[PDB]
Amino acid sequence: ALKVGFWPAYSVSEFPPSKINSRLFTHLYYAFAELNAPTFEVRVPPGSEKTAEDFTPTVRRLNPSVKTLISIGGGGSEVRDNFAKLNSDASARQRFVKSSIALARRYGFHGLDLDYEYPEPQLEMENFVKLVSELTAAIREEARTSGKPRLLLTEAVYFHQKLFPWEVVTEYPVQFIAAGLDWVNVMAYDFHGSWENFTGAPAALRDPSKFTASVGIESFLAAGMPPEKLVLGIPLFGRSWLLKNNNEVGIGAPAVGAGPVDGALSFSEIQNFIRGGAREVFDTTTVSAYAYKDNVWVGYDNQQSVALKVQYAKEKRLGGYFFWSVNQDIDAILPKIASDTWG
Ligand SMILES: CC(=O)N[C@H]1[C@H](O[C@H]2[C@@H](O)[C@@H](NC(C)=O)[C@H](O[C@H]3[C@H](O)[C@H]4N=C(N(C)C)O[C@H]4[C@@H]3CO)O[C@@H]2CO)O[C@H](CO)[C@@H](O)[C@H]1O
């Protein structure tokens, strides 16, 4: 059972790695190493070398069995642009592969992760295939020469197997992925947010809508992905809106922009929101929660919806679950219920 957490280096001042409850995880990811175009000598952001080095020893002090991976990239457009430039250039791909493996060993990580959002259109999938095939081979070669177990290799994927389900330009090659990677982290959230002028469940497990975690998972399984290669993503943040009218507070209510903070609110801040007078509602239709006060509305996962999602993952025979990102639940409320549920 994979119990995965992502720790983002940006959060180091307020949430250093020592604050992670690593007893609740099997694998903890450092986010992110940078691609470092144009050389593509992959590296942690200069100035964070000590934080990167200390990450794994620190988290293992509370749970020595926990393993770590370093994630390369991130969800931004600059990262996507850099992957697209990288993957078209065979020499650059070689530099990336060599440097990424050396990076993981340098800092004591047990694996590598690619966060490329997303390998589309078709040309970009084709070139990403070249990168990942070369990386898989180099990982196996390094295990042979070094004598150590091979580095784990994972990647972030869109919630759905098709890019995109409403207009298919390419799709994740599941047999390829299952052969070359240990698992994929399915980003089964961010379906709805302040970019829409109505409230919704940002990470709905299901809906009687096609943008749901279950529909996405179904698509990977239908394509032939071994269930154990799928790790279900669960957010530790909510998406927030400003309401058009304070007496329209349910799902589908009209909205007029992003709520705090610029449309995203950590679970810990949502707990504060509720303690400060917001009303929490569990929505059984979507398997999600929302909370509102005056003109602010936030959709998120709570103790009930997380337990239901984790049991869903168990019933669908998935490899496990992941949380993005662990700094957003400072008391580790949701990681605790998730771990208890799978156990
Ligand atoms: C470089 C930069 O923009 N730094 C920002 C920093 O950006 C963060 C946040 O915007 C994250 N958002 C939330 C709601 O947590 C964002 O998370 C993305 C991530 O990139 C993707 N990768 C995954 N994986 C599971 C691998 O999930 C997604 C998530 C969720 O959509 O990540 C970016 C950096 O990539 O934000 C901080 C604080 O706002 C800011 O100070 C600055 O450092």
Place of tokens 């196996």: 140
Rounded Cα–Cα distance for residues 34 and 54 (Å)? 18
CB of residue 207 inside a 6 A radius of ligand 1: no
CATH 2.40.50.140 is the classification of domain 1-235+301-343: no
CA atoms within 13 A on the CB side of 237: 20
Place of tokens 């007496």: 247
DSSP 180: H
Place of tokens 């929660």: 289
Place of tokens 């071994």: 226
- Of all protein residues, the one whose alpha carbon is nearest to atom 37 of ligand 1 is 10
| String of DSSP letters for 266-324 | EHHHHHHHHHTTPEEEEETTTTEEEEEETTEEEEE--HHHHHHHHHHHHHTT-SEEEEE
DSSP 182: S
- Of all protein residues, the one whose alpha carbon is nearest to atom 9 of ligand 1 is 75
Residue boundaries of the structural domains of the chain: 1-235+301-343, 236-300
CB of residue 10 inside a 6 A radius of ligand 1: yes
Expressed in angstroms and rounded, the spacing between residue 248 Cα and the centre of ligand 1 is 30
* Reported CATH class of domain 236-300: alpha beta
Name the active-site residue from 53, 117, 228, 248: 117
Element (H, E) at 138: helix 122-146
Rounded Cα–Cα distance for residues 172 and 129 (Å)? 10
Place of tokens 């002028």: 197
Rounded Cα–Cα distance for residues 277 and 274 (Å)? 5
Which two three-digit tokens encode residue 268? 């810990």
Q: Which of 22, 32, 31 is nearest to 57 (CA)?
A: 22
Expressed in angstroms and rounded, the spacing between residue 82 Cα and the centre of ligand 1 is 17
The atom number, within ligand 1, closest to the CA of 71 reads: 26
Q: Which amino acid is at 223?
A: A
CB of residue 265 inside a 6 A radius of ligand 1: no
Q: Which of 143, 136, 213 is nearest to 173 (CA)?
A: 136
53 classed as catalytic? no
CB of residue 313 inside a 6 A radius of ligand 1: no
CB of residue 154 inside a 6 A radius of ligand 1: no
Rounded Cα–Cα distance for residues 280 and 256 (Å)? 21
The atom number, within ligand 1, closest to the CA of 190 reads: 31
CB of residue 327 inside a 6 A radius of ligand 1: no
Pairing outcome for strands 2-8 and 27-33: parallel
Q: Which amino acid is at 285?
A: T
DSSP 338: H
Question: Taking CA 252 as the corner, what is the angle to CA 246 and CA 258, rounded to the nearest 5 degrees?
Answer: 65
Q: Which amino acid is at 41?
A: E
The atom number, within ligand 1, closest to the CA of 261 reads: 39
| Rounded alpha-carbon distances, angstroms, from residue 159 to 41, 118, 218 | 29, 11, 10
Q: Which amino acid is at 47?
A: G
Rounded Cα–Cα distance for residues 289 and 251 (Å)? 10
- Of all protein residues, the one whose alpha carbon is nearest to atom 34 of ligand 1 is 74
**Sign (positive or negative) of CA dihedral 75, 103, 320, 218:** positive
